Design a protein around this ligand. Sequence first.
Ligand SMILES: *[C@@H]1O[C@H](CO)[C@@H](O[C@@H]2O[C@H](CO)[C@@H](O)[C@H](O)[C@H]2NC(C)=O)[C@H](O[C@@H]2O[C@@H](C)[C@@H](O)[C@@H](O)[C@@H]2O)[C@H]1NC(C)=O
Ligand SMILES: *[C@@H]1O[C@H](CO)[C@@H](O[C@@H]2O[C@H](CO)[C@@H](O)[C@H](O)[C@H]2NC(C)=O)[C@H](O)[C@H]1NC(C)=O
Ligand SMILES: CCO[C@@H]1O[C@H](CO)[C@H](O[C@H]2O[C@H](CO)[C@H](O)[C@H](O)[C@H]2O)[C@H](O)[C@H]1O
Ligand SMILES: CCO[C@@H]1O[C@H](CO)[C@H](O[C@H]2O[C@H](CO)[C@H](O)[C@H](O)[C@H]2O)[C@H](O)[C@H]1O
Ligand SMILES: *[C@@H]1O[C@H](CO)[C@@H](O)[C@H](O[C@@H]2O[C@@H](C)[C@@H](O)[C@@H](O)[C@@H]2O)[C@H]1NC(C)=O
Ligand SMILES: *[C@@H]1O[C@H](CO)[C@@H](O)[C@H](O[C@@H]2O[C@@H](C)[C@@H](O)[C@@H](O)[C@@H]2O)[C@H]1NC(C)=O
Ligand SMILES: [Ca+2]
Ligand SMILES: [Ca+2]
Ligand SMILES: [Mn+2]
Ligand SMILES: [Mn+2]
Lengths: 237, 237
Amino acid sequence: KTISFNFNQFHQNEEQLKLQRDARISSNSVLELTKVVNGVPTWNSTGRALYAKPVQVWDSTTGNVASFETRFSFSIRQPFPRPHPADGLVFFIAPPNTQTGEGGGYFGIYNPLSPYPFVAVEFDTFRNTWDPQIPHIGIDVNSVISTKTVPFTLDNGGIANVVIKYDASTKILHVVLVFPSLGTIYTIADIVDLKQVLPESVNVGFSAATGDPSGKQRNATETHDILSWSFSASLPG
Amino acid sequence: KTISFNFNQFHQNEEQLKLQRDARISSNSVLELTKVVNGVPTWNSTGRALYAKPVQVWDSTTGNVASFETRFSFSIRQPFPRPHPADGLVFFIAPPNTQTGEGGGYFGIYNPLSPYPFVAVEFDTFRNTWDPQIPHIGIDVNSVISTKTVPFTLDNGGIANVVIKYDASTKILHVVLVFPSLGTIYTIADIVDLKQVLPESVNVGFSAATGDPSGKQRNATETHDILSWSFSASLPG
Ligand SMILES: *[C@@H]1O[C@H](CO)[C@@H](O[C@@H]2O[C@H](CO)[C@@H](O)[C@H](O)[C@H]2NC(C)=O)[C@H](O[C@@H]2O[C@@H](C)[C@@H](O)[C@@H](O)[C@@H]2O)[C@H]1NC(C)=O
Ligand SMILES: *[C@@H]1O[C@H](CO)[C@@H](O[C@@H]2O[C@H](CO)[C@@H](O)[C@H](O)[C@H]2NC(C)=O)[C@H](O)[C@H]1NC(C)=O
Ligand SMILES: CCO[C@@H]1O[C@H](CO)[C@H](O[C@H]2O[C@H](CO)[C@H](O)[C@H](O)[C@H]2O)[C@H](O)[C@H]1O
Ligand SMILES: CCO[C@@H]1O[C@H](CO)[C@H](O[C@H]2O[C@H](CO)[C@H](O)[C@H](O)[C@H]2O)[C@H](O)[C@H]1O
Ligand SMILES: *[C@@H]1O[C@H](CO)[C@@H](O)[C@H](O[C@@H]2O[C@@H](C)[C@@H](O)[C@@H](O)[C@@H]2O)[C@H]1NC(C)=O
Ligand SMILES: *[C@@H]1O[C@H](CO)[C@@H](O)[C@H](O[C@@H]2O[C@@H](C)[C@@H](O)[C@@H](O)[C@@H]2O)[C@H]1NC(C)=O
Ligand SMILES: [Ca+2]
Ligand SMILES: [Ca+2]
Ligand SMILES: [Mn+2]
Ligand SMILES: [Mn+2]
């Protein structure tokens, strides 16, 4: 049992994608998670994009958990250097049919009022109280307070290549971030037991958010574009 | 305490390096692990390059194991496509003062007669009986029969960037292989307890080998050049 899909680009109204909130697909075929007006990213924005069909990460009958690999490219343009860009984007796995959570530093995946479990890889650009220096890659399990963190220098407006791989046998989740224009490579990994955190079926996708109004800083924003995305999951039973 | 060294280039008569067997440094300052004459790689060649000073990966007094990160660039040119290039190169950690092992598929790190422990990351180009398709990256522990394997397409003559990171707290060894000219990224990781496999002090370096004469194939060869190499390790206490 191996499921998989590929998006070399995104078309308007893909029957395979479920867009929520501010998420939208541009004319250029790019998935814009957060609002961008007349070429300018806006604040107080939150958006998600989930693969329409649910994927089975583990089977309770056999006890087997799936191994998977996903690759995508994104771009984050920060037009306004000061006071501070925000907030970042994440790739996440969550139960089916969840609704966008809180924006801001919660990226739209954490819902303080009705929390749902999730595993996510974040590309954090704003330093909240619970954060280390930014930008940083983080591995999140049921919380925005990362288990592991690693700093990286953003290629403003440049393209970033990401590879996330999960090996069920070792329970290792390793992510690689590469900025081809700079030739920089960033790596991070951690042990995560998906069977202990998530239900048998889940949704996979992205979520991002720009500055929250409470910070009263309209400049706290940036773009969160996904240029391409491939996903492959393998369940031995 | 934390050891650290960097080789942005290799200078002939490199004081901080122990070259063994066919390993030598060209005029262009590249580390040629295996024999190349008049611009042509030869068979029946084996060579290693070790950092002259030993590094302490763990301390028996505190029980602490070191975390480390090493980055290097290599190039493998395969002049003769048919019948089959061989054999590949590896980055390895072994006890101090070891001597080049068997060539061929053993890369010069495995000594059937008098075996010594070692952890190595291989870039295998020839398919031996114990191998999956080639080329492939492999994680080796005391043996050339990899614990984990992942296939990759070689950029013939191109430059390859490698990042190997070891996190003592999680015991995760993750390696990233990138071919900038192709934009391809390959990743692999596994759990390895260095404290259970290696002595407190070790040597770090590279080793490679070309086709073994027993195969009666002079075309079973390729180059194994190391363009640059940086290493950093942190042993707390
Ligand atoms: C941030 O976005 C919110 C929605 O994404 C804004 O609220 C929405 O405002 C629309 C126009 O007023 C209204 O049609 C929507 O129903 C409403 N959504 C809800 C229920 O929150 C929010 O600002 C709102 O509108 C301004 C004019 C004020 O009335 C605010 O008090 C509202 O929340 C946006 N935040 C800000 C302050 O820009
Ligand atoms: C592979 O290389 C070895 C070593 O160069 C060749 O065997 C001989 O090894 C002895 C070591 O005591 C040297 O003194 C000889 O000079 C080596 N051969 C010669 C005369 O060059 C071995 O023959 C090589 N394999 C083949 C078939 O070419
Ligand atoms: C010490 C707490 O920090 C401040 O928290 C504020 C609201 O709780 C603001 O943070 C919010 O807005 C910023 C953008 O201005 C980000 O979107 C944060 O993620 C969001 O919580 C303020 O900016 C913080 O300094
Ligand atoms: C299935 C057995 O394969 C053959 O094994 C031979 C020796 O056991 C030869 O392999 C040796 O030489 C080749 C060069 O062509 C490589 O260097 C191998 O690593 C080495 O063991 C023969 O080539 C194999 O087909
Ligand atoms: C938000 O971004 C714009 C565009 O880069 C900046 O010009 C703003 O700077 C602020 O306004 C200008 C006119 C000047 O007074 C400067 O001192 C201010 O900092 C910037 N505004 C914020 C919120 O920093
Ligand atoms: C070894 O590589 C060279 C360079 O590509 C090839 O020319 C050889 O091809 C074979 O041998 C030559 C002499 C010629 O007869 C050709 O028709 C053969 O295919 C190649 N030899 C091997 C080991 O296959
Ligand atoms: Ca944050
Ligand atoms: Ca081999
Ligand atoms: Mn964070
Ligand atoms: Mn192998």
